[PDB]
Amino acid sequence: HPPAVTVIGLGLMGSALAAVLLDAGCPTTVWNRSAHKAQSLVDRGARLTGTPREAVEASPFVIVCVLDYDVLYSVLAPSVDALAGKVLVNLTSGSPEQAREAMAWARSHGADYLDGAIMTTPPGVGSPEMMFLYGGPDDVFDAHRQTLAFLGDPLHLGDDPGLASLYDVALLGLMWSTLTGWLHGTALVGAEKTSATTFTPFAVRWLTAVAGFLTTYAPQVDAGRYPGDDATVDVQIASIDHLLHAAASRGVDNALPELLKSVMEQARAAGHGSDSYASVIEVLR
């Protein structure tokens, strides 16, 4: 017994959301500035409207997934009178401050609001292993959980809508850091004719052990105390110089590991040479 659902925004991610809702048996209505992106969805049973307003009017449950929140206000400004009694689930990326403003704005026009963060690329939409993080009122999340569950694993962080976006940017920073370090290392072994496809399964496996380091170091970060029982900042400064040397000789730009070395040196200068790497957080605050 799924409800009628509308998706506003049919980009890479918006499309995928609409396709999953469609396959889950929802009557699916869509809108996008560029109508051509709807074509494949329409062929499969989605209704395309000419304007956002008609799309909003067509369903009690409205998802937005556009570039940013300015665009959201821009495309929905003409529909504000039609929002009353609706639920608006905003899966657009933004900052905590934008998320809290958007909730106030939606409530001012009589709509229920949840702010969400999609922790997957488009192929994983629909997979219950992929996290979707939500902030907003309990009641709204509980009433709509079953529909959200179509898209992935819906995790309600709490009543503050900014929480979703807070976790999101923190998690994205983690992702960009990992991707770039991976790419740097891949360039390095690649200069020796080791293919990325050969190296990467070792990287993937290694990330399991690295995730274990995160688990170990969490209670250290909360305590502000970083015992060097496993490996020390000083030892890590010595080994990063091997990375820098190897990369420099193979034509790989070292901005990233230079910065990481500097951050370790900063922590050492602050008295953390014999502490664990988690002590590096002392020089990020």
Ligand X SMILES: NC(=O)c1ccc[n+]([C@@H]2O[C@H](COP(=O)([O-])OP(=O)(O)OC[C@H]3O[C@@H](n4cnc5c(N)ncnc54)[C@H](OP(=O)(O)O)[C@@H]3O)[C@@H](O)[C@H]2O)c1
Binding of residue 203 to a copy of itself (CB under 8 A): yes
Site string for a copy of itself, 113-142 (x = CB under 8 A): ------xxxxxx----xxx-x---------
CB 181 within 8 A of CB 171: no
Report the SS3 class of residue 156.
Answer: strand
Q: Does 236 bind a copy of itself (CB under 8 A)?
A: yes
Tell me the closest approach of the beta carbon of residue 96 to ligand X, in angstroms. Answer: 14
Q: Is 90 in the site for ligand X (CB under 6 A)?
A: no
> Taking CB under 6 A as the rule, does residue 279 contact ligand X?
no
Q: Does 10 bind ligand X (CB under 6 A)?
A: yes
Q: Among ligand X, a copy of itself, none, what does residue 77 contact (CB within 5–8 Å per kind)?
A: none
Is residue 257 a contact point for ligand X (CB under 6 A)? Answer: no
Shortest CB 74 distance to a copy of itself, Å: 15
> Quick one: 79 or 273, whose CB is closer to a copy of itself?
273
The token duo for 108 is 């001012």
Q: Which stretch binds a copy of itself (CB under 8 A): 34-42, 47-55, 104-112, 220-228?
A: 220-228
Q: SS3 of 110, please?
A: coil
- Please give the annotated binding residues for NADP(+), written as ranges: 12-13, 32-34, 37, 65, 67, 93, 230
> Is 13 near ligand X (CB under 6 A)?
yes
Which listed residue (101, 199, 265, 270) binds a copy of itself by CB under 8 A?
A: 199
Tell me the window of 37-45, 104-112, 134-142, 164-172 that interacts with a copy of itself (CB under 8 A).
164-172
Where b means 16+ CB within 10 Å and e means fewer, 120-158 reads bebebbbeeebbbbbbbbeebbeebeebbebbbebbbbe
Amino acid residing at 237: I
The option from ligand X, a copy of itself, none interacting with 269 (CB < 5 to 8 A, set by class) reads none
Q: How many Å separate Cα 167 from the centre of its chain?
A: 8
* Shortest reach from residue 277's CB to a copy of itself, in Å: 6
Separation CA 2–CA 150 (nearest Å): 10
What type of residue sits at position 180?
T
Structural contact between residues 255 and 279, judged by C-beta atoms closer than 8 angstroms = no
Picked from a copy of itself, ligand X, none, the partner binding residue 37 (CB below 5 to 8 A depending on kind) is: ligand X
d(CA 244, CA 248): 6
Encoded tokens for 113: 């609001």
| Torsion of the alpha carbons at 143, 146, 152 and 155, rounded to the nearest 10 | 40
Would you count residue 124 as binding ligand X (CB under 6 A)? no
Q: Out of a copy of itself, ligand X, none, which partner does residue 263 contact, by CB within 5 to 8 A per kind?
A: a copy of itself
> How many helices (H) and strands (E) are present in the chain, helices listed first?
10, 8
CB within 8 A of 124, min separation 6: which ones? 130, 152
The entry of ligand X, a copy of itself, none that residue 169 binds, CB within 5 to 8 Å by partner kind: a copy of itself
Kind and range of the H or E run holding 94: none
261: contact with ligand X by CB under 6 A: no
Q: Pick from 25, 231, 269, 271: which binds a copy of itself (CB under 8 A)?
A: 231
